[PDB]
Amino acid sequence: MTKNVLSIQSHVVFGHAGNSAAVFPMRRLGVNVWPLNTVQFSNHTQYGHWTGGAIDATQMVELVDGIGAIGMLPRCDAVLSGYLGTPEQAQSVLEIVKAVKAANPRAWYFCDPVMEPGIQEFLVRTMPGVADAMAPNHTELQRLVGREIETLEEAVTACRELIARGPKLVLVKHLLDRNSPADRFNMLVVTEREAWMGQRPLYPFARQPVGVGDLTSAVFVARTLLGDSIRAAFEHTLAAVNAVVKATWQAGRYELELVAAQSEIAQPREWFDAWVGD
Amino acid sequence: MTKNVLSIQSHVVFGHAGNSAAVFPMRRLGVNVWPLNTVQFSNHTQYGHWTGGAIDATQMVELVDGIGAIGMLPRCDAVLSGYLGTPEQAQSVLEIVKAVKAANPRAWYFCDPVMEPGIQEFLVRTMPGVADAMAPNHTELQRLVGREIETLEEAVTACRELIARGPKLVLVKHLLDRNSPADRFNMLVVTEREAWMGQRPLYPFARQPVGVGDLTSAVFVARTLLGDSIRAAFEHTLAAVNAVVKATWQAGRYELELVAAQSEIAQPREWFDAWVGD
Ligand SMILES: [Cl-]
Ligand SMILES: [Cl-]
Ligand SMILES: [Cl-]
């Protein structure tokens, strides 16, 4: 039996961002994905211009109503959200998660709190109470606890403070460590009982590829649904992101080499061992 | 260098149809896909009810304008279309193909002519003049030449008549052969110089899975872009569709087992040799 994730993110026709970065890696790992596209744009916004449009917040919920009407919502094992442009879209995600958990009480919500008036406020004040897992980057974690974080102890303490508000797991998808060499890319994952740090090479780019955070959350969600332990899912995520970003760097590209490097999403060749962060 | 296909088809959030059937298999085979979603529905229409909506025809072209504005249209190696609900959407596909070929004269258009007033007429009267390849099923082929087809000779003759109008290749994605056993599923591919017949087992279903034709066209497009000969692309398509439909049948499912059977999209275990159809 194949697991199912409802992924509620942006769609771009060209390139990779949002669902265009997240759906294929999760499928390639062996998990089904129901992509609810909150927008359809020609390309991601870091090119500086794009065409297309967003669906409205009520239409998001209506799509999930349709899935419910054909009897499929109990099959949803997880909900994943990432960048949302408006608080109205975030409210629809809340409504959708409630509907999914009513149909399947075992379902969990993985909120990647990517940070219009009200959207930072929504992610900080409201989403922790409904998310089973959150995946902030370093600056998003600082906003979630309302203070600066520069040590590993401060990072773990902050994650545990956020966990006390509801989430059972915090994935710091990029951790800044003032004591770490500048050519290393650090990550951290924390639960009530566990804390794991990990590190991969940082590849240099003139402009940062879009979608690395979306890929990170997607691989972690898929490996978790496939039954990995916290540490195993974390290490596979670190290694898979390493493989894709390395391949992007090696080819001198800007858009992630997701299709070209797909074998190493599923079976990364270069592995990085996590270490105890507590 | 990875090839790129612009795939202009429906999107369904749950299940597989249109781009939800076509995008993942092409990516899994090693080709990039730019999905231009003509609609976003909750699920495919053979459940009998759905929610969601279509984008308008002008918005389709505007998405491609955006890709052109960031300089990417010369990278498009093929355009793929399948089911279109309105002649206005079909006209937008025509406009898009013209723009793509202006940016890249080597690009080709693969029209799966899935058959509102005017859409059969458009596919029969207008699309042959612009499509480099068409993938009708048996009844669509009969409509394209305006007569009944029951022998293999009649099928090859009909394909060659259609080729004389413009297309260089006709993939009959399901060929009805009155002389073939009822538990066989036949296909045919014809060019000016070649004709290949092939056959796989027909798996019995209470209701036919949606997306088999979309999967067929997608695998054939991807294998062609990867450099396969006509016969090689045809055989890989036959074997990959066999693998997915067999896995769907074996699990007693209705929606195609695309993710579960993905290894056999790329490397089918059971192979069927084509034979000369001329
Ligand atoms: Cl950060
Ligand atoms: Cl995909
Ligand atoms: Cl038919």
CSV table of C-alpha atoms in Angstrom, one decimal, chain A residues 66-213:
chain,number,residue,atom,x,y,z
A,66,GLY,CA,-14.2,17.2,-4.3
A,67,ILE,CA,-11.7,14.6,-3.1
A,68,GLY,CA,-13.9,14.0,-0.1
A,69,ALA,CA,-17.0,13.6,-2.3
A,70,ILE,CA,-15.4,10.6,-4.1
A,71,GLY,CA,-14.5,9.0,-0.8
A,72,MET,CA,-10.7,9.5,-0.9
A,73,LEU,CA,-9.9,11.8,2.0
A,74,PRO,CA,-9.3,8.9,4.5
A,75,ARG,CA,-6.4,7.8,2.3
A,76,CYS,CA,-4.5,11.0,2.9
A,77,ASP,CA,-1.5,10.2,5.2
A,78,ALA,CA,0.0,13.7,5.4
A,79,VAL,CA,-0.5,17.3,4.4
A,80,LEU,CA,2.4,19.4,3.3
A,81,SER,CA,2.4,23.2,2.8
A,82,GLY,CA,5.2,25.6,2.0
A,83,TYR,CA,5.2,29.1,0.7
A,84,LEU,CA,1.8,30.8,0.9
A,85,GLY,CA,1.3,34.3,-0.3
A,86,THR,CA,-1.7,35.4,1.6
A,87,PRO,CA,-3.3,34.7,5.1
A,88,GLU,CA,-6.5,33.7,3.2
A,89,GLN,CA,-4.6,30.8,1.6
A,90,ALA,CA,-3.1,29.9,5.0
A,91,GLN,CA,-6.6,29.8,6.5
A,92,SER,CA,-7.7,27.5,3.7
A,93,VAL,CA,-4.7,25.2,4.6
A,94,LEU,CA,-6.0,25.1,8.2
A,95,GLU,CA,-9.5,24.2,7.1
A,96,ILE,CA,-8.1,21.5,4.8
A,97,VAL,CA,-5.9,20.0,7.5
A,98,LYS,CA,-9.0,19.8,9.9
A,99,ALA,CA,-11.0,18.0,7.2
A,100,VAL,CA,-8.2,15.6,6.5
A,101,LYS,CA,-7.7,14.7,10.1
A,102,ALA,CA,-11.5,14.2,10.5
A,103,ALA,CA,-11.4,11.7,7.7
A,104,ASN,CA,-8.1,10.1,8.9
A,105,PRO,CA,-7.1,10.8,12.5
A,106,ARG,CA,-3.7,9.4,11.9
A,107,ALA,CA,-2.9,12.0,9.3
A,108,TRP,CA,-0.2,14.6,10.1
A,109,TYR,CA,0.5,18.1,8.9
A,110,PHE,CA,4.0,19.2,8.0
A,111,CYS,CA,4.2,23.0,7.7
A,112,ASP,CA,7.2,24.5,6.0
A,113,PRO,CA,6.7,28.1,7.3
A,114,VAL,CA,8.2,30.0,4.4
A,115,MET,CA,8.3,33.7,5.4
A,116,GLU,CA,1.6,40.6,2.3
A,117,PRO,CA,0.5,41.8,5.7
A,118,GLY,CA,-0.5,38.9,8.0
A,119,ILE,CA,1.4,35.9,6.7
A,120,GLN,CA,4.4,36.0,9.0
A,121,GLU,CA,2.0,36.7,11.8
A,122,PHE,CA,-0.2,33.7,10.8
A,123,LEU,CA,2.7,31.3,10.6
A,124,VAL,CA,4.1,32.4,14.0
A,125,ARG,CA,0.9,32.8,15.9
A,126,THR,CA,-1.5,30.3,14.5
A,127,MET,CA,0.2,27.5,12.6
A,128,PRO,CA,2.2,26.0,15.5
A,129,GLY,CA,-1.1,25.1,17.2
A,130,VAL,CA,-2.1,22.8,14.2
A,131,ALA,CA,1.2,21.6,12.7
A,132,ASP,CA,2.5,18.2,13.7
A,133,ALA,CA,5.9,19.2,12.3
A,134,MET,CA,7.5,22.5,11.2
A,135,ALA,CA,10.5,23.0,9.0
A,136,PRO,CA,11.7,26.6,9.5
A,137,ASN,CA,15.0,27.8,8.2
A,138,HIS,CA,17.3,29.7,10.7
A,139,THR,CA,15.6,33.0,10.3
A,140,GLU,CA,12.1,31.5,10.4
A,141,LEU,CA,13.0,29.7,13.7
A,142,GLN,CA,14.2,33.0,15.2
A,143,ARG,CA,10.8,34.6,14.3
A,144,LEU,CA,8.9,31.6,15.7
A,145,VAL,CA,10.5,32.1,19.1
A,146,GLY,CA,11.1,35.8,18.9
A,147,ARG,CA,14.8,36.0,19.5
A,148,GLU,CA,18.2,35.7,17.9
A,149,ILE,CA,19.8,32.2,17.8
A,150,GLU,CA,23.6,31.8,17.2
A,151,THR,CA,24.7,28.7,19.3
A,152,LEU,CA,23.6,25.0,18.9
A,153,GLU,CA,22.3,25.0,22.5
A,154,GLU,CA,20.2,28.1,21.6
A,155,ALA,CA,18.9,26.3,18.5
A,156,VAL,CA,17.9,23.2,20.4
A,157,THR,CA,16.3,25.2,23.2
A,158,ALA,CA,14.3,27.2,20.6
A,159,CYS,CA,13.1,24.1,18.9
A,160,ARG,CA,12.0,22.6,22.2
A,161,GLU,CA,10.1,25.9,23.0
A,162,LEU,CA,8.3,25.6,19.7
A,163,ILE,CA,7.5,21.9,20.4
A,164,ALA,CA,5.9,22.9,23.6
A,165,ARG,CA,3.3,24.9,21.6
A,166,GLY,CA,2.2,21.9,19.6
A,167,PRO,CA,4.5,20.5,16.9
A,168,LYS,CA,6.2,17.2,17.7
A,169,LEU,CA,9.2,17.8,15.4
A,170,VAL,CA,11.2,20.8,14.2
A,171,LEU,CA,13.4,20.4,11.1
A,172,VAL,CA,15.7,23.4,10.8
A,173,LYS,CA,16.2,23.1,7.1
A,174,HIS,CA,19.3,25.5,7.2
A,175,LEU,CA,21.0,26.1,10.5
A,176,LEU,CA,23.4,29.0,10.8
A,177,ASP,CA,26.3,28.1,13.1
A,178,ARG,CA,28.8,30.9,13.7
A,179,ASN,CA,31.4,28.3,14.7
A,180,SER,CA,31.1,26.3,11.5
A,181,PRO,CA,33.3,26.9,8.5
A,182,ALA,CA,31.6,29.1,5.8
A,183,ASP,CA,31.7,26.3,3.2
A,184,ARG,CA,29.5,24.0,5.2
A,185,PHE,CA,25.7,23.8,5.1
A,186,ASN,CA,24.3,22.7,8.5
A,187,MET,CA,20.9,21.2,9.4
A,188,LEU,CA,19.2,20.3,12.7
A,189,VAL,CA,16.2,18.1,13.6
A,190,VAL,CA,14.7,18.2,17.1
A,191,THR,CA,11.9,16.3,18.9
A,192,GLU,CA,11.1,16.0,22.6
A,193,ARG,CA,13.5,13.1,23.0
A,194,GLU,CA,16.0,13.5,20.1
A,195,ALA,CA,18.3,16.1,18.5
A,196,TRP,CA,20.4,15.5,15.4
A,197,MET,CA,22.9,17.8,13.7
A,198,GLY,CA,24.2,17.2,10.2
A,199,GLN,CA,26.4,18.9,7.7
A,200,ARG,CA,27.0,18.8,3.9
A,201,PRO,CA,29.3,20.9,1.7
A,202,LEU,CA,27.9,24.4,0.8
A,203,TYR,CA,28.1,24.8,-3.0
A,204,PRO,CA,28.8,28.4,-4.2
A,205,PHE,CA,26.3,30.1,-6.6
A,206,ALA,CA,26.0,33.6,-7.9
A,207,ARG,CA,22.3,33.4,-7.2
A,208,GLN,CA,20.8,30.8,-4.8
A,209,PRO,CA,18.8,28.1,-6.7
A,210,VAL,CA,15.1,28.2,-5.8
A,211,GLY,CA,13.4,25.2,-4.3
A,212,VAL,CA,16.1,23.8,-2.1
A,213,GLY,CA,13.9,24.2,1.0
